[PDB]
């Protein structure tokens, strides 16, 4: 079991990063989306925060 226990974990663990790593990218431009939108002032700064 333990053999199959973590061996799954790590892999699913792998899937974790790949999601959030993208997800970071998701927020990443998401941040960037803000700053520009705030830079141009189309939007508030609070959002950027």
């Amino acid at each position: 079991q333990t053999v199959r226990s973590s061996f799954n974990n790590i892999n699913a663990s792998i899937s974790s990063i790949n999601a959030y790593k993208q997800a970071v990218v998701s927020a990443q431009s998401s941040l960037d989306a803000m700053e520009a939108g705030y830079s141009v002032g189309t939007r508030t700064i609070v959002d950027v925060l």
């Binding site: 520009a36 830079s39 141009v40 002032g41 189309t42």
Partner: protein
């Protein structure tokens, strides 16, 4: 009357100034609308510039 009767007059010359009440007023009309018209495009262009960036 703007002129001395019998006198010699230039073209396009104001002769009789007529009450422009309803007119000067009226002139105001488009003015605001122009003022307001431009207002819309103002934002719009204000937007477009942003979107551009």
């Amino acid at each position: 009357r703007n002129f001395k009767e019998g006198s010699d007059i230039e073209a396009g010359v104001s002769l009789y100034q007529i009450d422009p009440a309803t007119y000067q007023a009226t002139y105001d009309s488009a003015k605001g609308d122009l003022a307001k018209a431009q207002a819309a495009a103002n934002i719009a262009q204000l937007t477009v510039n942003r979107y551009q960036k």
